[PDB]
A paper describes a structure:
To understand the molecular mechanism for pH-dependent antigen binding by [name], we determined the crystal structure of the [name] antibody in a complex with α-cobratoxin at different pHs. Accordingly, we determined the high-resolution structures of the [name] mAb produced as a single-chain variable fragment (scFv) in a complex with α-cobratoxin at pH 6.0, pH 5.5, and pH 4.5 at 1.49 Å, 1.60 Å, and 1.55 Å resolution, respectively. An SGGS hairpin in the CDR-H3 protrudes between finger I and finger II of α-cobratoxin and is stabilized by a disulfide bond between Cys100CDR-H3 and Cys100eCDR-H3, facilitating a hydrogen bond between the backbone of Gly100cCDR-H3 in the hairpin with Thr6 in finger I. The binding is further stabilized by the formation of a short β-sheet interaction between the backbone carbonyl and amide of Cys100eCDR-H3 and Val37. Further analysis reveals the presence of additional hydrogen bonds, cation–π interactions, and a charged hydrogen bond (salt bridge) with the side chains of residues Arg33 and Arg36 on finger II, which occupy the center of the paratope. The [name] light-chain stabilizes a cation-π interaction between the side chains of Tyr100iCDR-H3 and Arg70 on the C-terminal tail of α-cobratoxin. This interaction is facilitated by a hydrogen bond and salt-bridge interaction with the carboxyl group of Asp95aCDR-L3. While the interactions facilitated by Asp95aCDR-L3 and α-cobratoxin are equivalent at pH 6.0, pH 5.5, and pH 4.5, Asp95aCDR-L3 is present in the light chains of chain-shuffled mAbs A04 and G09. Our simulations indicate that the conserved histidine residue in the CDR-L1 loop of both mAbs (His34CDR-L1) has a higher probability of protonation at pH 5.5 in [name] (protonation probability: 0.59) than D11 (protonation probability: ∼0.00). Protonation of His34CDR-L1 in [name] was accompanied by a significantly increased water molecule network around the histidine imidazole group, which enables the paratope to adopt a greater number of conformational states that are unfavorable for antigen binding at pH 5.5 compared to pH 7.5 (c also).
Here, we use a panel of human monoclonal antibodies with neutralizing activity to long-chain α-neurotoxins (LNTxs) to investigate pH-dependent antigen binding. To establish the molecular basis for pH-dependent antigen binding in these antibodies, we determined at five different pHs the crystal structures of two neutralizing antibodies ([name] and D11) with different pH-dependent binding affinities to LNTxs from the elapids [name] and Bungarus multicinctus.
Residue numbers in the entry:
A (entry chain A): 1 to 71
B (entry chain I): 1 to 52, 52A, 53 to 130
C (entry chain M): 0 to 9, 11 to 100, 115 to 123, 1017 to 1022
Write the structure that this text describes.
């Protein structure tokens, strides 16, 4: 699968993976800089702990970097 | 720590343009944003704009929008400010300055831009406009 | 158009007393204020970040506050070498501008007014 990967925020080929993931959470700067975003690929959807969100998907480049919409 | 090293003094005619460089030595940029801040003789600090290379997005002050271009060459860790249509009150010392709050760290990046305090400053470049 | 920061151009402080430099803005307490010191012929140096934090190495006698319509840089027990220009600074997300105050020159007097 091809997925976007942080911190380069580029699409890499992951020959042995088959899901992309978007992991997001707040650090102390979440109000001014938005959530932290970890993009990557895995063989299966990773687990995250409380306070962290993860969304997984199974098509090439299905995890584009989600910037905050600036009102 | 990383340093920012700017190009030398420029002497320009009115109507001409100038391009000043800012090399991030002792290190690199990429995850860090770089602003340009000028200071006319005897006056205060004035933001020109800045660039966040990891998002390829530049932000400009209204006073200079349409006259100014800020770029960054991530391979040489050099940022540039090009200021066009020069006039006499563009005479100033021009600084580059790093945003203290990096956009990426340890496998993740922030998702919005917000210019934080400026921790590392270049030595400044004197630009003089006259005939 | 853009958010306005108002600083007094100048402040006089007797040696060893307290210097207070205001930075006023419309509900500036909603903003995050940074402060820079600058001495003649030198580049600026951050002395307060995020209203009230001191970067590593900055003396304890520098402190900051921000509430309501006024942010304040306080230099306690002021010393000769604290004579400098001080600039407050915000990022105004509404206009996508870094805004500097006009700067305050802090002059440290040679003598007290009254013993
Ligand atoms: Cl986690
Ligand atoms: K410098």
């Amino acid at each position: 699968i091809r997925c976007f990967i942080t911190p380069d925020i580029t699409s890499k080929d992951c020959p042995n993976g088959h899901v992309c993931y978007t992991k997001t959470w707040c650090d102390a700067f979440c109000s001014i800089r938005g959530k932290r975003v970890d993009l990557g690929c895995a063989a299966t959807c990773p687990t995250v702990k409380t306070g962290v969100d993860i969304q997984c998907c199974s098509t090439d480049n299905c995890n584009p970097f989600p910037t905050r919409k600036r009102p | 720590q990383v340093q920012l090293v700017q190009s030398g003094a420029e002497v320009k005619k009115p109507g001409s343009s100038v391009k000043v460089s800012c090399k991030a030595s002792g290190g690199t940029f990429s995850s860090y944003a770089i602003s340009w801040v000028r200071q006319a003789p005897g006056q205060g600090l004035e933001w020109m704009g800045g660039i966040i290379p990891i998002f390829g997005t530049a932000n400009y002050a209204q006073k200079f929008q349409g006259r100014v271009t800020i770029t960054a060459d991530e391979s040489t860790s050099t940022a540039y400010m090009e200021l066009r249509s020069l006039r006499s009150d563009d005479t100033a010392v021009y600084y580059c300055a790093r945003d203290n709050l990096g956009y990426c760290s340890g496998g993740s990046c922030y998702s919005d831009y917000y210019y934080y305090y400026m921790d590392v400053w270049g030595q400044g470049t004197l630009v003089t406009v006259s005939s | 158009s853009s958010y306005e920061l108002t600083q007094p151009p100048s402040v006089s402080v007797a040696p060893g007393r307290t210097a207070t430099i205001t930075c006023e803005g419309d509900n500036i307490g909603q903003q995050i204020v940074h402060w820079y010191q600058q001495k003649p012929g030198q580049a600026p140096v951050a002395v307060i970040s995020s209203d009230s934090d001191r970067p590593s190495g900055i003396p304890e006698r520098f402190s900051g506050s921000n509430s309501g319509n006024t942010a304040t840089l306080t230099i306690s027990r002021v010393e000769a070498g604290d004579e400098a220009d001080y600039y407050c600074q915000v990022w105004d997300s509404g206009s996508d501008h870094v805004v500097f105050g006009g700067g305050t020159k802090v002059t440290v007097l040679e003598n007290l007014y009254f013993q």
